[PDB]
Amino acid sequence: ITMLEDHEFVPLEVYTRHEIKDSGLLDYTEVQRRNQLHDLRFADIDTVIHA
């Protein structure tokens, strides 16, 4: 008679939630964020020209 040896079940997923989220071609918030940084970066949103 021998004892059943101890076993450690390491965490294991086929697909992590991060890569599941990244599986989509276009990412919702990332696309919106880039399209809204577009104006702030490639243009000045504070300078005012009066003439």
Binding site: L4, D6, H7, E8, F9, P11, L12, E13, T16, R17
Partner: peptide, 29 residues
């Protein structure tokens, strides 16, 4: 300082508990 990330999928811990319970019982008996 750092933020830890959960792996989700608690199935690993559930199988760990099930195996621990069954192994403890069968080993004792």
């Amino acid at each position: 300082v750092e933020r830890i990330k959960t792996t989700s999928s608690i199935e690993f811990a559930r199988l760990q508990f099930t195996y621990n319970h069954i192994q403890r019982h069968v080993n004792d008996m």
